[PDB]
Design a protein around this ligand. Structure first.
Ligand SMILES: Nc1nc2c(ncn2[C@@H]2O[C@H](COP(=O)(O)OP(=O)(O)OP(=O)(O)O)[C@@H](O)[C@H]2O)c(=O)[nH]1
Ligand SMILES: Nc1nc2c(ncn2[C@@H]2O[C@H](COP(=O)(O)OP(=O)(O)OP(=O)(O)O)[C@@H](O)[C@H]2O)c(=O)[nH]1
Lengths: 438, 52, 50, 46, 150, 427
């Protein structure tokens, strides 16, 4: 009906897959068993749960999500958690060796002999699926292993199924915190390989999520237990429109056809504004005006870019909970009247609004708060040019002095790819400068 | 027990009267006699030491 | 006895070496009819001979 | 160190794990489930 | 483990710890040679020799010690002044220290071995034999009845 | 699945392995006898990286012990864990060594190699898939160098796809004991630099200093030294056998750690050292773990990099931390001294965070660093070799063995090449 296919790769992937599916189970009331309490809902497999789960004639809810990893550690852990019985067994595919941060290793030496079973699984889900609107991919550009494999498999899907959308949600390389030296290499390779088969891209940054964590959630000792939960809330927000019913609904088809201005550039940014603690939300007020001002507050985004050093051209606002369009348009009009926000001329309006009356959820054992109104913002801007400038003036030096290239010429490649990637990136900057030019 | 339990009279039902007075006096005498007795024990054991 | 290893067949100088040990694992119990249990009148089993 | 359990009672071990199951070398039985079943049925050595 | 010295001349106390090799611990003088007051529910009086017996407990500035031994001279002076000893106690074995130096005595080699021999017993009892007679019953089997062995 | 086979070469490596193995086993919960005691699920699972399985629950190590002096292996077998070692992997010769490297490299090793190769390939086929081999040996000890050079050389072309983690002890810059140590070390390092990829070099002078600094007992043993070094290798190996949102593989470390083929030398570093009374006088907190880790007195491998500069560093923590504290500590050190590192590369910091704290504490760490600080060491050995070579004393033995002084000349050439490239890079 209205359903998508989910793919997570990497120890970084199963991280957020774990968190997100745990969140997923509560709102549909899914105990770790797979079958429900007394009240009957099963049928021709036709009610809300269907958009993510495929509850078979068994009554067990079986997700349409595939977890691929090349290391036995995290896959054994997740298979030994509590939610193990739900997951489909060889929809949880494991390997024995790593790419050792080497994107070429992850794409060439090992990935060839696993994508065969990957294809098997993905098409034997596609056959049963009915609408098959889109894909949900989870990886990291600075992938230690999940970079090259993800690129290869997305290329294969691009060449076999050339009709649906492709959505990417990745932890972007942190600008000034780097866990190794391979990150510029693997990032530039993945980006320049995927520029023409990726449809829509979203990047997030752990430093910014940390700053929010000790800014308004004011707990200085959280972990991924916090961060993955927040990003999972983001994805729940972006899929609520497909999940439930509402006054007016908006689909990822429209997301693609609107948020991208023009080809190449398909890199917006996201934000959940009312991230706030239990006590805060308890004894302070919440309404439309303040949450909209907050969603334009620059320091609550998840990439260190200065909007006033950039310029906006697109915005997609999702309201979840109880709202009416009148104060909605009031607030958006007030912000348009406000001046420091610098809209590029080419968009007279740039706002697409999606309303879903259902309020978001709260998870037991969590630190979030009761929500009646939630705003999720997806905006495309020009402020991220600084990121690519940083990465290129990083990579230039390493290419100049030829360090670690032995590791790659050993596994069987040359410098043509390394060089070609930088002119791809340069094309990105020239196009962004042109679109900043009126 | 007695002085503790006679502390839950609601509103004006408390009289601080002669019973209270003499019960307090009884507490005084208990403590004072205990002190004297302990002192006497001390002297006794010391002189037993001398006998040994 | 309990030999540990043989380094000889590497070359040929003697009939190889016999390194010893210090813990003697696998010594299994086999008692034998000594001089003690001997008297006119007793029971002795001799491979099935009462 | 300070942590939680694993290999809970018989019913267990979705096939796919690497690793050493304790006392895993009596496998004339054939299904992964029955293997694991007898494995946890046999901690009896002490 | 600690030593307690009582100076009668001024009624003062000095506590120290003996030096132990490979301690990995500070040592030397503990609390100096002064007066010590009780723990406070009351402090104006100080300790006096009239309360010191073996197998009892004391505390000094929150440092609780237990008495387990004394000296010949101590027994002389106590059976000179009057307190009655209870039967002396028992001192335990410090676990870390005992384990580490039993490991370091495990590291104290002798190059051991064991072997065997036959000749001396062989010769001592060479060329002697005992001679003894016996009988086996056979009528159990329905064919044989008796036969004699030596 | 992935496993490791250990090489215990020469007399040094023998006692090193004794301590190392008993340390791993005691942490991992196997008795000296062999009958494990059920306590820990996760160790019970990941035991297969090292220990293979006999019947009944008794575990065979995948280690190969070699030496030439039978009494050495007699003493090792006498230790509390000879019964946890196997006679099968006990192989030995008859002749004393004299710690002559040419002896170890051309005459008796020439026939001792074959049998050990056959046994090790037996075990290598017994297992499923190795990632490489870790070797424990000496470069100032004769038999270790003379044999291990040949061994590493041949295994390199045996299997060209595995990691040669090497662990070689280094002679004292103040007393070299074996007077022919210059010759031994030079000849050994010649093939070391060729065959090895990663090497840890260990000198015991800093061990003595740390015995006077934090061990603070002044009456130590080589056993205590082995305790410390064994703990360090334990720490480097922990990540594999344990869960956590970290990367473990030695290759995941090395390919991140080394930029160029000719860079191989490495500096072990440890985490909280606890003295006589610092137990109850210390708070085990992130700032102080970071500080002590980075401390110069704390460093114990070769010498202070104060004269030089850093190239890369990696750190493995083991405890219930969070990512934010380690990231902010990394920024703090970076911006406290952004000069002592090299502007060539950013982000010279490598991290791993395991969630399985060791036995006895709650959080711990280990530090490995590549810094331009081994220049002084191999420069010292340069003067040693030259000042000896100018009058060819003692060379009659080596000539009688039968080689040329020309080979010595190429050895000193390669050594000076390392000197030159370290200098030419850092400066
Ligand atoms: N999605 C996700 N990412 C994380 C998490 N924690 C850290 N990260 C980031 O994700 C990155 C992990 O990517 P990689 O190391 O390349 O993973 P990989 O290529 O699949 O293979 P490995 O070398 O085994 O990790 C790290 O550098 C972190 O910055 C997490 O819990 N979830
Ligand atoms: N195991 C051990 N090794 C030590 C000890 N003290 C010093 N060593 C060093 O260990 C070095 C070599 O050990 P091996 O690897 O067996 O080297 P080798 O070829 O036998 O040469 P040498 O032992 O030096 O004669 C010696 O050169 C010593 O410098 C110690 O107490 N125990």
């Amino acid at each position: 009906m209205r359903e998508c296919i989910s793919i997570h790769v990497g120890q970084a992937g199963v991280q957020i897959g774990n968190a997100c599916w745990e969140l997923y189970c509560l709102e549909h009331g899914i105990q770790p068993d797979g079958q429900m309490p007394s009240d009957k809902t099963i049928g021709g497999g036709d009610d809300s749960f269907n958009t993510f789960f495929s509850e078979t004639g068994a009554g067990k809810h079986v997700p349409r999500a595939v977890f691929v990893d090349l290391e036995p550690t995290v896959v054994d852990e997740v298979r030994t958690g509590t939610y193990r019985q739900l997951f489909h067994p060889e929809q949880l595919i494991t390997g024995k060796e790593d790419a050792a941060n080497n994107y070429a290793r992850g794409h060439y030496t090992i990935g060839k002999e696993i994508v065969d079973l990957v294809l098997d699984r993905i098409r034997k889900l596609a056959d049963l699926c009915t609408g098959l609107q889109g894909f949900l991919i989870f990886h990291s550009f600075g992938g230690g292993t999940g970079s090259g494999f993800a690129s290869l498999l997305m290329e294969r899907l691009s060449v076999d199924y050339g009709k649906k959308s492709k959505l990417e949600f990745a932890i972007y390389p942190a600008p000034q915190v780097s866990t190794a030296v391979v990150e510029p290499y693997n990032s530039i390779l993945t980006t320049h390989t995927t520029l023409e088969h990726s449809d829509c891209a979203f990047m997030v940054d752990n430093e910014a999520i940390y700053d929010i964590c000790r800014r308004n959630l004011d707990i200085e000792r959280p972990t991924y237990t916090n961060l993955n939960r927040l990003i999972g809330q983001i994805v729940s927000s972006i899929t609520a429109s497909l999940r439930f019913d509402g006054a007016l609904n908006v689909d990822l088809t429209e997301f693609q056809t609107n948020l991208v201005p023009y080809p190449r550039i398909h890199f917006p940014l996201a934000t959940y504004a009312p991230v706030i603690s239990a006590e805060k939300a308890y004894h302070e007020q919440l309404s439309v005006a303040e949450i909209t001002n907050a969603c334009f507050e620059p320091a609550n985004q998840m990439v260190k870019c200065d909007p006033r050093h950039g310029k906006y051209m697109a915005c997609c606002m999702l309201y979840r909970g109880d709202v009416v369009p009148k104060d909605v348009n009031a607030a958006i009009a007030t912000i348009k009247t406000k001046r420091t926000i610098q809209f590029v001329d080419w968009c007279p309006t740039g706002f697409k609004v999606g309303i879903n009356y259902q309020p978001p959820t709260v998870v037991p054992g969590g630190d979030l708060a009761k929500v009646q109104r939630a705003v999720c913002m997806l905006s495309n801007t020009t402020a991220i040019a600084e990121a690519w400038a940083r990465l290129d003036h990083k990579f230039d030096l390493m290419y100049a002095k030829r360090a670690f290239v032995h590791w790659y010429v050993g596994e069987g490649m040359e410098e043509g790819e390394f060089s070609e990637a930088r002119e791809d990136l340069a094309a990105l900057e020239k196009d962004y400068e042109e679109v900043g030019v009126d | 027990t007695r002085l503790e339990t006679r502390t839950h009279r609601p509103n004006v039902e408390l009289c601080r009267d002669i019973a209270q007075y003499r019960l307090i006096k009884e507490i005084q005498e208990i403590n004072h006699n205990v002190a004297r007795l302990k002192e006497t024990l001390a002297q006794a054991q010391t002189q037993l030491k001398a006998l040994y | 006895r309990a030999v540990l290893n043989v380094y000889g067949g590497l070359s040929e100088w003697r009939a190889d070496g016999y390194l010893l040990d210090k813990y003697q694992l696998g010594k299994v119990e086999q008692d034998f009819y000594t001089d003690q249990d001997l008297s006119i009148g007793a029971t002795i089993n001799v491979w099935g001979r009462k | 160190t300070q942590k939680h359990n694993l290999f809970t009672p018989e019913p267990h071990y979705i096939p796919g794990y690497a690793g050493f199951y304790p006392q895993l070398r009596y496998q004339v039985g054939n299904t992964y489930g029955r293997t694991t079943a007898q494995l946890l049925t046999d901690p009896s050595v002490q | 483990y600690y030593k307690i010295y009582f100076y009668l001349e001024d009624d003062t106390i000095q506590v120290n710890e003996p030096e132990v090799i490979n301690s990995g611990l500070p040592q030397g003088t503990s609390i100096r040679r002064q007066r010590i007051p009780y723990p406070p529910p009351n402090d104006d009086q100080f300790y006096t020799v009239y309360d010191f017996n073996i197998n009892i407990s004391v505390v000094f500035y929150g440092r609780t010690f237990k008495i387990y031994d004394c000296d010949p001279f101590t027994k002389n002076f106590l059976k000179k002044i009057g307190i009655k000893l209870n039967p002396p106690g028992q001192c335990p074995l410090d676990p870390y220290m005992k384990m580490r130096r039993e490991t370091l005595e495990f590291v104290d080699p002798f190059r051991p071995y064991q072997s065997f021999d036959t000749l001396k017993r062989f010769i001592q009892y060479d060329g002697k034999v005992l001679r003894f007679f016996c009988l086996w019953d056979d009528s159990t089997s329905l064919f044989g009845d008796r036969r004699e062995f030596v | 699945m992935r496993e490791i086979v250990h090489l215990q070469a020469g007399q040094c490596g023998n006692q090193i392995g004794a301590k190392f193995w008993e340390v791993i086993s005691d942490e991992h919960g196997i008795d000296p006898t062999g009958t494990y005691h059920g306590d820990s699920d996760l160790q019970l699972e990941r035991i297969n990286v090292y220990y293979n399985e006999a019947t009944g629950g008794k575990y065979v190590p995948r280690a190969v012990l070699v030496d030439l002096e039978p009494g050495t292996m007699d003493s090792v077998r006498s230790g509390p864990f000879g019964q946890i070692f196997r006679p099968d992997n006990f192989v030995f010769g008859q002749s004393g060594a004299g710690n002559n490297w040419a002896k170890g490299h051309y005459t008796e090793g020439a026939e001792l190699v074959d049998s050990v190769l056959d046994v090790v390939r037996k075990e290598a086929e017994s297992c499923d898939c190795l990632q490489g081999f870790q070797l424990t040996h000496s470069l100032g000890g004769g038999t270790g160098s003379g044999m291990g050079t040949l061994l590493i050389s041949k295994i390199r072309e045996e299997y060209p796809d595995r990691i040669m983690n090497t662990f070689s002890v280094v002679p004292s810059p103040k007393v070299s004991d074996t007077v022919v140590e210059p010759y031994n070390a030079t000849l050994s390092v010649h093939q070391l630099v060729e065959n090895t990829d990663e090497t840890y070099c260990i000198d015991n002078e800093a061990l003595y200093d740390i015995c006077f600094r934090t061990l603070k007992l002044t009456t130590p043993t080589y056993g205590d030294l082995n305790h410390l070094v064994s703990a360090t290798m334990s720490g480097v190996t922990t990540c594999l056998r344990f869960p956590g949102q970290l990367n473990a593989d030695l290759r995941k470390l090395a390919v991140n750690m080394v930029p160029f083929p000719r860079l191989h030398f490495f500096m072990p570093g440890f985490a909280p050292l606890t003295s006589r009374g610092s137990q109850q006088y210390r708070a085990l907190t992130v700032p102080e773990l970071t500080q002590q880790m980075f401390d110069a007195k704390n460093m114990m491998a070769a010498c202070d990099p104060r004269h030089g500069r850093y190239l890369t560093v990696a750190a493995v923590f083991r405890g219930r931390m969070s990512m934010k504290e380690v990231d902010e500590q990394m920024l703090n050190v970076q911006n406290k001294n952004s000069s002592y590192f090299v502007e060539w590369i950013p982000n010279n910091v490598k991290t791993a965070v395991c969630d399985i704290p060791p036995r006895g504490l709650k959080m711990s760490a280990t530090f490995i660093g590549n810094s331009t600080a081994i220049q002084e060491l191999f420069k010292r050995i340069s003067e040693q070799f030259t000042a000896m070579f100018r009058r060819k004393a003692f060379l009659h033995w080596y000539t009688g063995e039968g080689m040329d002084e020309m080979e010595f000349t190429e050895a000193e050439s390669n050594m000076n090449d390392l000197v030159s490239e370290y200098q030419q890079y850092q400066d």
